[model samples]
Target chain A: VDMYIERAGDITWEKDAEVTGNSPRLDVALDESGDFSLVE
Target chain B: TTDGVYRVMTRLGSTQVGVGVMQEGVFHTMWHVTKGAALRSGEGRLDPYWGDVKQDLVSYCGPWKLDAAWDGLSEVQLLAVPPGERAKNIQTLPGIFKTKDGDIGAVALDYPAGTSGSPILDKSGRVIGLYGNGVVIGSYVSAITQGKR
Candidate 1:
């Protein structure tokens, strides 16, 4: 499948931007014993 | 943002989706359900840099869909393209994968910030789905399928 690419520049996600204040529902099950951690 | 955060926009909706990736200069992202829904239900635009760039949300799979599809998925692939490469000479990372038996989703190696929206691929590099926003990828996929925000 062909991938979509932006016309130019870097992709950015700005905090406190237009999309805000919504709690997301967690549907994917995480394996607690499998050893997964976010890079904080 | 130092967290490798990026902002994406849906053309019709009035909100910008904040996406986080595991890398410093990656734009591929997975956003929350509300925003993903907004983007998919309408016209969406992304910023490859500082301007509006056109992109499509094609490889979306929700939790229900993923759960149904994840029968023998023991491993998955994630791709990382450099900051300015824009889909050329990409690097693929493979990791172990397992779905929680009774949870709403699956678990793989804890990928970084820029890993959002990275394609979850099979060993053959066949894209099975997009992964990001944690388990919320399912929620976003669900919303995209239902045309809701």
Candidate 2:
């Protein structure tokens, strides 16, 4: 199986232009439930 | 039960996780969801990936006993097993994890599809996070606990 490894902490969704020096391939956000809302 | 792998489905999408530690008699996996995802419609089951294996619900059970001291330093194992013991396969991988706010931990693992809520374990077989696209934990515990879905 081909697995894709994302760098942990490499992505954070603070705003549209928040850069943590890592490119985010997936968007992780907080839903109403406080769990992650992952966008791929 | 610890050897079991499960799949959780919500209205938005579905994800999978390995059965980790149990607290207060309820078996808990990691927490993962998407925007506009509802947990009341959440259903989980053991492998086979289909058919009537759904489990009962209790209105809500928050993720209790989240490891407050977990740091992404130790190696963790991800379990890939069927409902039966014969198909149990554990994949141990490095916790190549990082933090955004320095309080929560996210581990980088190439988990298969439907593995979002799956548990990521430390070397001692304790859950560190739930597979949320990437493995995530920390503030999520409150999200689940407060939402009650």
Candidate 3:
């Protein structure tokens, strides 16, 4: 098995079973999580 | 300008679309420009042949370059060449695909900016759709930064 960490870029996701905004009948989700930790 | 660009993405309706492993350059840069990240290559699908798509919104993940920068609007060109071999897949509702190559044929504006008033032309220079927002049904757009469009 091989392991390497890759990062995610600009993203917007629709929420499951939830409506967060008016224009988007769907919820907007953004994956802000990155591979590195700030404290470390 | 950065905020404007973000607004453009959101207004385009991709705001509901998840980033997944795919992402745009803006996301990575905004996060950690130095580390550098690998995101999903947006080069999804394109028409098998030029101008085959007559309707529905189409999103191509290839690449686009700045042809000419003008006031209020910038002239951008598609990165795909020869058109005969590019992918033509429009990510939309399951039954929306119309061609064997899969097309999101001409339909009303799925997003607000999908109007000819804000046209997105094909490689042959025909009005494929508008770019006021979202991936236009029978229209098109090119995403940048480094992730999913």
Candidate 4:
């Protein structure tokens, strides 16, 4: 996996970091009591 | 007992870790939300992501399809190996990892989907870092808490 930080300010040549981490995805957010909600 | 580490929900469906501090019956995770983690719901799961976090256990944090996070490094290096102990084949650190003696393994980051904001909890339950493609120290989270990021 490439670990390069996006939106860099550097104009000079830089090496990209490779390798990697954390999870499955969540489609919507949930409330305090396990209730789900959408931001829109 | 200690509801410190929380399962933070990131935008577009990634569930990561958030270190929570409570106030007046509400839990607030004061740290940097991942690249797209913000404005999802403004909340975090109050339960602690308990157990020997260094151990390879199934993570049900995201509440999506069942998946897991493994310990790439041993307990010495934040339970995550340093970026440059340096493997020869995969010179840099590898995100896809499997524990030496267990059925624990995974592609370490949320490359295609999620996990950009999971907390890298210290053994004492203090959230010392957050995981994106790589793990970053907790010090940077202060920059976020103060609203600089």
Segments of candidate 1 deviating more than 4 angstroms: A1-40, B1-29, B37-74, B82-112, B135-149
Candidate 2 chain B: worst-modelled 10 consecutive residues by lDDT: B48-57
Q: How would the docking of model 3 be graded? A: incorrect
* Span of ten consecutive residues with least summed lDDT in model 1 chain B: B140-149
Give the CAPRI class of candidate 4.
incorrect
List, residue by residue over B1-76, the lDDT tens digit for candidate 4.
1223233333244333332222123333322322222222233323322212222121222211111232344220
Model 1 earns a TM-score of 0.32
Candidate 2 CAPRI assessment class: incorrect
Give per-residue CA lDDT, model 4, range A1-40, as digits (tens).
Answer: 1111111111111133232323212223323332223222
The 10-residue segment with the lowest total lDDT in model 1 chain A: A13-22
In the range B45-71, model 2's lDDT, one tens digit per residue, is 222111111111111133344352344
Q: Flag clash pairs in model 4.
A: A1-A19, A20-B95, A21-B108, A21-B109, A25-B13, A26-B13, A26-B14, B17-B118, B95-B108
lDDT (10s digit) by residue, model 3, range B1-149:
11101111111223312111112212212222112222232332111111112211222233222121111122222111111222111222111213223233222223322111122223233223222222222333221121122
Instruction: Quote model 1's iRMS.
Output: 14.7
TM-score of each: 0.32, 0.40, 0.20, 0.24
- Per-residue C-alpha lDDT of model 3 across residues A1-34, encoded as one tens digit per residue: 1112122212222122121111111111112232
Query: After aligning candidate 3 to the native by TM-score, how far in Å is the CA of B61 from where it should be?
Result: 14
Residues A6-38, candidate 2: write the lDDT tens digits: 111111111222111121233345434433444
Ranking by TM-score: 2, 1, 4, 3
Q: DockQ, per-model, please? A: 0.06, 0.04, 0.02, 0.04
- Which of the predicted structures, 1 or 4, would earn the higher lDDT when compared with the native? 1
lDDT at B85, model 1 = 31
